[PDB]
Amino acid sequence: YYECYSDVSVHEEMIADRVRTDAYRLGILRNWAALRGKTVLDVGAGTGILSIFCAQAGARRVYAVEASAIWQQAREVVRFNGLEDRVHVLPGPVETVELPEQVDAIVSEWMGYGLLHESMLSSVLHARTKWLKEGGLLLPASAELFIVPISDQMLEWRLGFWSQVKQHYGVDMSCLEGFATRCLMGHSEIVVQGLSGEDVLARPQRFAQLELSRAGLEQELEAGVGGRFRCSCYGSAPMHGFAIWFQVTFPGGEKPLVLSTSPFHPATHWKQALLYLNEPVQVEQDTDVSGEITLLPSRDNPRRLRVLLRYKVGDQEEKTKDFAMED
Amino acid sequence: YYECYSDVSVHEEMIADRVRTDAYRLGILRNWAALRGKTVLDVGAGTGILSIFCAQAGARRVYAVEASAIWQQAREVVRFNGLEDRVHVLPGPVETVELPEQVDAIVSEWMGYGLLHESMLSSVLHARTKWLKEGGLLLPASAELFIVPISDQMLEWRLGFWSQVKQHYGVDMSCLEGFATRCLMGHSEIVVQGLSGEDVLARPQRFAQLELSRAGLEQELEAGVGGRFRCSCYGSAPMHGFAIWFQVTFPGGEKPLVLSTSPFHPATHWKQALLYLNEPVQVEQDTDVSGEITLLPSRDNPRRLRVLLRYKVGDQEEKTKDFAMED
Ligand SMILES: Nc1ncnc2c1ncn2[C@@H]1O[C@H](CSCC[C@H](N)C(=O)O)[C@@H](O)[C@H]1O
Ligand SMILES: Nc1ncnc2c1ncn2[C@@H]1O[C@H](CSCC[C@H](N)C(=O)O)[C@@H](O)[C@H]1O
Numbered sequence: 027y028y029e030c031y032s033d034v035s036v037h038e039e040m041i042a043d044r045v046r047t048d049a050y051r052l053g054i055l056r057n058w059a060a061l062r063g064k065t066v067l068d069v070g071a072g073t074g075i076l077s078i079f080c081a082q083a084g085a086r087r088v089y090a091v092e093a094s095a096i097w098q099q100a101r102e103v104v105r106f107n108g109l110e111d112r113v114h115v116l117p118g119p120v121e122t123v124e125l126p127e128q129v130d131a132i133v134s135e136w137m138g139y140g141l142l143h144e145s146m147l148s149s150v151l152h153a154r155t156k157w158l159k160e161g162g163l164l165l166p167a168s169a170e171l172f173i174v175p176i177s178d179q180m181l182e183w184r185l186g187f188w189s190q191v192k193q194h195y196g197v198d199m200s201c202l203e204g205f206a207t208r209c210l211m212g213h214s215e216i217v218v219q220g221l222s223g224e225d226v227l228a229r230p231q232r233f234a235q236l237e238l239s240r241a242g243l244e245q246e247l248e249a250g251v252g253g254r255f256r257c258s259c260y261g262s263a264p265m266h267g268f269a270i271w272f273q274v275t276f277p278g279g280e281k282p283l284v285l286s287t288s289p290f291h292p293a294t295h296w297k298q299a300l301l302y303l304n305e306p307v308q309v310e311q312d313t314d315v316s317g318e319i320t321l322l323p324s325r326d327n328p329r330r331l332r333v334l335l336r337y338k339v340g341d342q343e344e345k346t347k348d349f350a351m352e353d
Numbered sequence: 354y355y356e357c358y359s360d361v362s363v364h365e366e367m368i369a370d371r372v373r374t375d376a377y378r379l380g381i382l383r384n385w386a387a388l389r390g391k392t393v394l395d396v397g398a399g400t401g402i403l404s405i406f407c408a409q410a411g412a413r414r415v416y417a418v419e420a421s422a423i424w425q426q427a428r429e430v431v432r433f434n435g436l437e438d439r440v441h442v443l444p445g446p447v448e449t450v451e452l453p454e455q456v457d458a459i460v461s462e463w464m465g466y467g468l469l470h471e472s473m474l475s476s477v478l479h480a481r482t483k484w485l486k487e488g489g490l491l492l493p494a495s496a497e498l499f500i501v502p503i504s505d506q507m508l509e510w511r512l513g514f515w516s517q518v519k520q521h522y523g524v525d526m527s528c529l530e531g532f533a534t535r536c537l538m539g540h541s542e543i544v545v546q547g548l549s550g551e552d553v554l555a556r557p558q559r560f561a562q563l564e565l566s567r568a569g570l571e572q573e574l575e576a577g578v579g580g581r582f583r584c585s586c587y588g589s590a591p592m593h594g595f596a597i598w599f600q601v602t603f604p605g606g607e608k609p610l611v612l613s614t615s616p617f618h619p620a621t622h623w624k625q626a627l628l629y630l631n632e633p634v635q636v637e638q639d640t641d642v643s644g645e646i647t648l649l650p651s652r653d654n655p656r657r658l659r660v661l662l663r664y665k666v667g668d669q670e671e672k673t674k675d676f677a678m679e680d
Binding site for chain 2: 041103107201205212
């Protein structure tokens with residue numbers, strides 16, 4: 027016994043996310059021809075599930091590297107499944123692990139909220155450089171970031187709550203809408219929240235593409251990744267801000283398999299990352315929404331995501347609002 | 354503007370709790386004959402809603418005392434409802450507020466999780482002693498605590514999760530049930546969680562009664578409140594521990610109005626407080642469950658609730674497990 031509530035809950039949530047975990051299983055299995063008889067490094071193996079997917083896909087040897095105490099559980103899951111000759115669970119950070127050979131492939135689930143919040147991406151790139159054979163397989167191989175203006179229905183309900191008190195209790199609290207807006211939208215924190223398709227006000231725009239084999243990607247991440255965007259709204263709505271999300275792609279190796287966290291696709295534990303304006307803005311059919319967005323490490327905590335945003339909605343003047351990931 | 358996310362969310366949750374807020378409205382209105390033309394102190398007035406209920410009930414003057422920044426919102430709700438001649442919002446803690454008279458009544462919603470976690474009860478008793486007229490009204494007037502053995506279905510699902518991985522992903526993770534049990538039940542924290550009637554394994558037992566007018570109740574709270582209990586289980590079940598909850602009573606004052614947080618009654622934001630055994634124990638029809646329970650302030654933080662529990666299930670030996678409120 028050690029206190030392990032966080033350990034089990036985090037791994038439960040990941041494995042319960044079927045969209046995530048099936049995307050990795052099928053993404054890996056579809057590369058069976060490239061993995062059969064080959065070696066694999068699983069960066070951040072957790073409970074060992076992806077390492078075992080690789081063995082199912084036919085790998086001769088999988089190195090399951092895991093820095094935290096959950097490695098103990100990984101060792102047990104492998105022993106219990108009788109795969110200890112094929113999957114070797116190794117303690118500690120990938121940056122200092124010692125493998126006996128370069129590998130044919132790396133597999134990793136490294137993506138954080140907003141893709142880059144508290145992500146293991148730097149560790150995956152460190153391992154690719156140190157251990158992956160020239161021309162080796164990376165699963166997934168790339169990631170893309172998307173942005174779109176949104177109307178959050180749950181936020182709308184919360185903003186309107188104070189005007190419904192009279193109907194329920196004979197006390198008029200509608201004067202608190204200002205207060206509620208300032209508290210719920212006036213902050214500078216990125217809010218993780220699940221939206222649906224009807225919340226999306228325009229065509230989503232891709233604003234960055236991250237090819238994990240690209241030279242200098244580590245330095246891109248430090249300078250900031252992102253870019254400009256532009257879109258046109260579909261109809262009348264209270265725009266509350268933007269949602270950002272990602273997808274990652276597995277080569278087939280056939281056509282690629284995409285794991286998406288878009289509000290149009292089945293929900294994942296990543297949900298989306300929301301960037302609220304200080305207050306709502308009414309948009310109409312064809313309202314132009316544009317801007318420039320950058321994702322980079324926070325100054326005071328290099329594993330916390332910060333977002334620099336400059337945007338323009340219709341005829342409103344350009345505005346800056348910069349965010350950091352919620353506590 | 355100040356950062357006020359916590360402010361609005363806490364008050365939203367309280368006012369959205371209709372069971373709570375209607376119990377106070379009807380509890381107060383039913384005492385209209387005793388309040389009409391009289392004076393009231395609202396201890397911890399928040400947004401001012403209970404103070405306005407008192408004015409609706411006919412009070413001549415209500416002192417709405419509130420220690421934190423939400424007082425500013427209270428002042429606005431009163432101004433906006435045009436009740437500033439009848440309801441006076443006053444800043445700061447009730448312990449140092451200066452009223453111009455003793456009052457005919459105190460109203461307060463002071464109850465925390467498990468009744469006594471981070472509760473304002475000491476402040477209500479301080480105000481009763483300092484400001485309430487001899488024979489004055491207290492709303493509510495009393496509280497009662499209850500305990501019962503439980504089977505938590507949501508916990509059961511979480512304990513069983515690891516044995517379902519094989520069906521979904523071809524990896525057998527059933528060997529992790531031990532781990533999951535240790536992490537989810539082996540800790541010593543009180544867990545706030547909503548149960549339903551079917552989770553209850555026996556007749557609930559009252560283990561304490563707190564009459565707010567009782568002399569020396571402050572000293573009882575410091576020594577610990579609680580007592581012994583005994584009950585008999587209804588049928589075969591995996592017992593996970595105990596749930597505790599409270600009710601408070603408003604004199605009519607007609608028959609009393611009771612605000613209950615029992616799992617048999619409509620859900621409130623208080624839910625119930627759960628005390629998990631280190632692992633499940635199978636019980637049967639007529640299994641005797643007994644013990645002794647005390648609620649008191651934690652040593653290192655006098656506003657955190659601690660629970661001392663000694664219990665016996667059937668033929669199992671007596672056991673001690675002591676808890677402190679979750680972070
Ligand atoms: N630098 C590093 N080296 C090794 N493991 C790391 C690491 N940084 C984070 N980790 C671990 O990587 C894991 C990411 S979570 C993904 C777990 C598992 N592969 C699954 O898909 O279900 C966590 O268990 C975390 O402890
Ligand atoms: N010692 C004290 N004096 C005055 N206010 C206090 C206090 N201790 C806590 N409070 C305040 O008491 C409130 C309790 S929450 C209840 C709020 C409101 N009466 C309602 O029923 O909706 C909080 O707003 C908290 O800031």
